[PDB]
Design a protein around this nucleic acid. Structure first.
Ligand SMILES: [Mg+2]
Ligand SMILES: [Mg+2]
Lengths: 109, 44, 53, 116
RNA sequence: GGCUCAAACUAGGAGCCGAAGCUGCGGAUUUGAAACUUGUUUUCAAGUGGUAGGGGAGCGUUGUGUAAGCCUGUGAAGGUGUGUCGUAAGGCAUGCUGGAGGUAUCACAAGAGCGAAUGCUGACGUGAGUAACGAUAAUGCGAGUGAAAAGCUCGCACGCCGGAAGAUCAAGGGUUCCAGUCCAACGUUAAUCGGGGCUGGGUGAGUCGACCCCUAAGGCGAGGCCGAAAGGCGUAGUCG
RNA sequence: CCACUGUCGUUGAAAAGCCAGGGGAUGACUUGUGGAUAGGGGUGAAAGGCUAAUCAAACUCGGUGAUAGCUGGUUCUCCC
RNA sequence: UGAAAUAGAACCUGAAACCGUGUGCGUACAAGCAGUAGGAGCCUCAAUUUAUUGGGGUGACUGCGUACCUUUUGUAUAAU
RNA sequence: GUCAAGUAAUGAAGCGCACAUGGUGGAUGCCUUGGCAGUCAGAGGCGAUGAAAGACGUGACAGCCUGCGAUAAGCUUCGGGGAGGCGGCAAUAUCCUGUGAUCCGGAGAUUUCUGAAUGGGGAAACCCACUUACCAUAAGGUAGGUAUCUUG
């Protein structure tokens, strides 16, 4: 089986979290946690939180051995965008997209 | 630089206020029109 | 000064074929046994068998 | 009697996008581009139904020329020899024989060469 | 490309290639002609590129009747695949999704069909993780708290203003003031901080200001004058 | 108070600014508060200037769905 | 709990644009409206007394091939 | 086995196509509390007994909406009705109710301030009064009156 965690609504662009996700996809839980704890990217704190939640789900709700677990699948999806107005010169306005993202992690043997 | 709106309460209430509207027949028509549209603000 | 056509998603992603997160080198501290960034002290102050606090 | 266009517009656009399956980029995804690509595909297909009859005769004639020159004759003398011998075998079948049955094509060349 | 008794030129000859032309085979269709004769049947002849435009035949959609019918929780509409049928518009069946409606047939009526109108609304792209983060007065470190501290608090040091970048007001604003608590949003970064959220508190006058008494400009103005009406002016006054 | 020159800035810090210089600075000076003049009208040491980022006739609403021999667009199918 | 929770409160259905992940095939010596007519190889379902056909995915390689609308005498037009 | 010559296959930083499975988004379908056009009738006004329109209050309970007006989600009475109820968001608490509540219909009472606004004035919801009667003895309270015009 595959155990899931979801981190819907992280205040960050999915394009940014995707670089973090690409490096932990398919790795063992230990190696992936190392990569996430020593990354300098903001998206790594979100990916690490979601991965830790998925590991705890697999250990508590399903009684799996987290020693044989691995990041079976991970992907980031776009969340809801907050729309803000940015004033510019000469009385002109721009729209600002404050993008959010959904992180889905599934761990399994 | 100096802009178009320079607020003054006395000047606002004396050019646009309720008693200024009620002093004229045309101001009372302004009020009748605002009441017919149902505006929550009759006068400044 | 601006594009004459929108870029295709294929070319947009070929330009991102060089984007990559940096992965830190890690080691095990001889005294504590703990993982740390290479050439960096551990989170608790140990580097190369030497305390700092 | 107000008519909403949603359902019919949807199924109409799905027909076009279905015919545009496998096309690159916007050509399989967005309707304004897919509908031109489908029309152009039909135009090319109409033109190439005609052109394929020319291309395959081209191919048969090439293979017959090779087969006849293997036997000591050119295409323009071999076809003349067939028409003089009253042999009605078409170029499609002659090319098939030249490709897959060399001795029979040798026999046909012998008949044409005896007719000249 | 390459070509010189040519792969050039002249004059002849014979083959062959070559088009959606012509022929062959199958199918459709317009008109006309013949006969079981409103497609009932077979034929035959001539046709069938097309803008503006004229003429003919239909498809689908919403709604009315047919219909207190018929279908439908043993799964309606819609969505999404697949198969199949028709010259086309399109029809039919069916898997999955969906969960309460739909509608045969024949008539009847249209808010009846969209890719363009620098069309209208919403959503979402490309540019691009690019430019920028708003005065070049400036920060360093130690503690504290905290999930987390370059930015908060405290401390030491450094720097800046000082006819201000300090202080008191009027105008304007209106709770922003003070404390506690929170960090989603807001703050162009983070935030434990805030003029942000939430909950409480806080403004005390005979003398300060207003009100009040008085009048300026200028208003309004018993009577009065003027003017189709509306109104305009104006005395005493009354406001300001 | 003003705005002569230049650089900068021109998707600005800013729908007219900054910086460095510049002019007037007891006067036809500047400035606060209140008031007056209203659209073919006002006001103007006069540039058609200004009259709320709008001026060779403001703004709002209405006549009004102005008119447009012009430009754009005009949505299913097949047959002659 | 509920019939149902990709009915969980941004909550019926949940299209498209747009953006991910996975699987199969192709793609790093080759010049252009990106298709079309052919066509090798591979992958996958079925039959079939067993690598042959049939269906599906992909498409090395060859030929041909300058979008659409509008407006024009005439547009790939570098005209809208 | 060496060497030589020739010739395959394998590669994927990334990308394409198809399918599978999601995200976003909010179309579609169904739905309705809301609109639109009429018919047949009725009515065609409200206001100095203070209107229309408001401001400020009013609850056990913070805001808004609704009602109400210092008697303030209401008071009296007359009828209806018969078991629940204290308006909505929107519940909670204290309670009321067959000694008839909530609720509905007729009538009455109360009815702040502004506004024709009418005692004067005014930047509406404010400032300042005069006067009659009564009560208080202190710096007031209660009930009134005081605009203009027309006609008598
Ligand atoms: Mg101006
Ligand atoms: Mg839903």
């Amino acid at each position: 089986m595959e155990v899931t965690a979801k981190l819907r609504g992280a205040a960050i662009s999915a394009q940014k979290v995707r670089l973090v996700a690409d490096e932990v996809r398919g790795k063992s839980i230990e190696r992936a946690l190392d990569i996430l704890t020593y990354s300098n990217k903001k998206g790594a704190v979100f990916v690490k939180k979601c991965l830790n939640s998925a590991i705890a789900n697999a250990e508590h709700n399903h009684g799996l051995d987290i020693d044989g677990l691995k990041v079976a699948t991970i992907y980031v999806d776009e969340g809801i965008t907050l729309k803000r107005i940015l004033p510019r010169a000469k009385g002109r306005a721009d729209r600002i997209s404050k993008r959010t993202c959904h992180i889905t992690i599934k761990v399994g043997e | 630089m100096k802009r178009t709106f320079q607020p003054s309460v006395i000047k606002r209430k004396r050019t646009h206020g309720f008693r200024a509207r009620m002093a004229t027949k045309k101001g009372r028509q302004v009020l009748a029109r605002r009441r017919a549209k149902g505006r929550h603000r009759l006068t400044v | 000064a601006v594009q004459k056509s929108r870029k295709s998603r294929s070319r947009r992603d070929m330009r991102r074929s060089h984007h990559h997160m940096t992965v830190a080198e890690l080691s095990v501290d001889a005294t504590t046994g703990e993982k740390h960034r290479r050439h960096h002290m551990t989170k608790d102050g140990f580097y190369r068998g030497r305390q700092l606090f | 009697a107000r008519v909403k266009r949603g359902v019919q517009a949807n199924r109409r656009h799905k027909k076009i996008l279905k015919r545009a399956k496998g096309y690159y980029g916007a050509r399989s995804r967005v309707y304004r581009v897919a509908v031109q690509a489908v029309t152009k595909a039909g135009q090319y297909a109409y033109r190439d139904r005609r052109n394929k009859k020319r291309t395959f005769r081209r191919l048969w004639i090439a293979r017959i020329n090779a087969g006849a020159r293997l036997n000591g004759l050119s295409y323009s003398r071999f076809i003349n020899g067939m028409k003089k011998a009253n042999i009605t075998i078409d170029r499609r079948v002659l090319a098939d024989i030249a490709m897959h049955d060399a001795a029979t094509f040798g026999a046909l060349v012998e008949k044409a060469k005896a007719e000249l």
